[PDB]
């Protein structure tokens, strides 16, 4: 299970987007016993929060998930080759760290509830 | 995250069906440490039970989910405007509380396993 963990952290973003299961499988597992239980419970809560974020974006059971949210060049004006063939996910996260919540709020409530209401109203037809 | 929590509890059911993410994001987080750990673990188990109920209805990753279960007028004979533009979800829950398990058993086993077997047998074709 642990084999290959984080091994594409120095690879390009595209090369590292082909090992997502390796890092997804490694996210789940006296006074010492309660400290370790608190660590395990926090890991569980953290996994559940991430999966809830995926589920409120229409991205459940998906390691790669496309959306209807346009990319803003204000967030990043780099070209596709620069990002996917000339950058790592760590550098990317450093670059977009101050824009993450804007994207997460454009995915959270606008796109998904709009799309979901439209599917309900199309299912009416 | 907490902003807007339960703020549509006095709004109509339709107006309150547009803020579901606000209440979905607020469902996940010595001797005192074990009491609080038990509270956190029970919150996790409760969220998992709700998500399991959604998943056995074909409603995973969905805040609004349509089904193939007809509404019975015995459960409620009210008109759509009464329910969605003239009632709150609290009053609704008060009205249907003694019919919830019938609906949940018509969603649990009939609709979903029937539909799922039919998708398997159509995938055979």
């Amino acid at each position, epitope marked *: 299970v642990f084999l290959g963990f984080l091994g594409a952290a120095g690879s390009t973003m595209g090369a590292a987007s082909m090992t997502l299961t390796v890092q997804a499988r490694n996210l789940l597992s006296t006074v010492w016993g309660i400290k370790q239980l608190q660590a395990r419970v926090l890991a569980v809560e953290r996994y559940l929060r991430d999966q809830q974020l995926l589920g409120i974006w229409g991205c459940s059971g998906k390691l790669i998930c496309c959306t209807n949210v346009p990319w803003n060049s204000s967030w990043s004006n780099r070209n596709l080759s620069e990002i996917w063939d000339n950058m790592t996910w760590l550098q990317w996260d450093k670059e977009i760290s101050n824009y993450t919540q804007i994207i997460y709020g454009l995915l959270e409530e606008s796109q998904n509830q*709009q799309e979901k*209401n*439209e599917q*309900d*109203l*199309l*299912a*009416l*037809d | 995250v907490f902003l807007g929590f339960l703020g549509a509890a006095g709004s109509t*059911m*339709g107006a309150a*069906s547009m803020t579901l993410t606000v209440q979905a994001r607020n469902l996940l987080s010595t001797v005192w440490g074990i009491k609080q750990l038990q509270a956190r673990v029970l919150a996790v188990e409760r969220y998992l039970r709700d998500q399991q109920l959604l998943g056995i209805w074909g409603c995973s990753g969905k805040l609004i989910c349509c089904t193939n279960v007809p509404w019975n007028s015995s459960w409620s004979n009210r*008109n*759509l*405007s009464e329910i*969605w*533009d003239n009632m709150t979800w609290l009053q609704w829950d008060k009205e249907i509380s003694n019919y919830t398990q019938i609906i949940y058993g018509l969603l649990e086993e009939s609709q979903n396993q029937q539909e799922k077997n039919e998708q398997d047998l159509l995938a055979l074709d």
Partner: antibody, heavy 123, light 108 residues
Framework: EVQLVETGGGLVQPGGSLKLSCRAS????????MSWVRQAPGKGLEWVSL????????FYVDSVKGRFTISRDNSKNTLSLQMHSLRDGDTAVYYC??????????????????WGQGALVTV | ALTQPPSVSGSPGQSVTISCTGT?????????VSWYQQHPGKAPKLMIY???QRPSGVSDRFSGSKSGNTASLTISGLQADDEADYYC???????????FGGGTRLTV
């Protein structure tokens, strides 16, 4: 009380671009679907386009799918129809109408209850 | 599209029955058949919806019915104002939405 007023009719040349519009007053514009229905001068009615209450479900008749575009602004209480590449069969008086579909939280509205004055497009 | 009689002739005080027969996918599949009255020179008005349902502000003289794949509008007690062009519409599905029939002149 309900009044729909169409504007933007005119004389266009085959292949031109026009933008019809309809104004509404007397009701909650954001809680009804809106449709465009055309009557050619010598023939009967024909349904052209449909838009939902919110404005994100758009339906078109087979003829005009790629050419016509329906849109609505629920703050200005205005419905619009962009018609590109107008051919010769598109000459008719266009009516903006209320109805055609509804939300899941309302009853079925498979009909047009309120119509407009009319706007003649000759092309 | 649907087929409607080109003209229907009536005399004051008696009844008249316009018809609209369609295929099995529009009228025989969906109970959503509407009738509209367009006076000469003005815009259409809703007379009947949902086969048998009547909008508020419309007299009981206008009545609707359906049998199989055929819909019928019956106007009792014909008056001068009844003279108009009458069109039947049916909801045909979510791919093709609304199909209209040709007009019908009523002469009283």
């Amino acid at each position: 009380e309900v009044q729909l007023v169409e504007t933007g009719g005119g004389l266009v040349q085959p292949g031109g671009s026009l933008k019809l519009s309809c104004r509404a007053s007397g009701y909650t514009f954001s809680s009804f679907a809106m449709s465009w229905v055309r009557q050619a001068p010598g023939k009967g009615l024909e349904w052209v386009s449909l838009i939902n209450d919110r404005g994100g479900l758009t339906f078109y008749v087979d003829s005009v799918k790629g050419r016509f575009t329906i849109s609505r602004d629920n703050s200005k209480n205005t419905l619009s129809l962009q018609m590109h590449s107008l051919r010769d069969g598109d000459t008719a008086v266009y009516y903006c109408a209320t109805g055609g579909m509804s939300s899941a939280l309302q009853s079925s509205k498979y009909y047009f209850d309120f119509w407009g004055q009319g706007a003649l497009v000759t092309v | 599209a649907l087929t409607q009689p080109p003209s229907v002739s009536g005399s004051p005080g008696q009844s008249v029955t316009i018809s609209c027969t369609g295929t099995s996918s529009d009228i025989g599949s969906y109970n959503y058949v509407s009738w509209y009255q367009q006076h000469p020179g003005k815009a259409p008005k809703l007379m009947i919806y949902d086969v048998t349902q009547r909008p508020s502000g419309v007299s009981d003289r206008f009545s609707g019915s359906k049998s199989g794949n055929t819909a019928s509008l019956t106007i009792s007690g014909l008056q001068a104002d009844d003279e108009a062009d009458y069109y039947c519409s049916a909801y045909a599905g979510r791919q093709t939405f609304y199909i209209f029939g040709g007009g019908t002149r009523l002469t009283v």
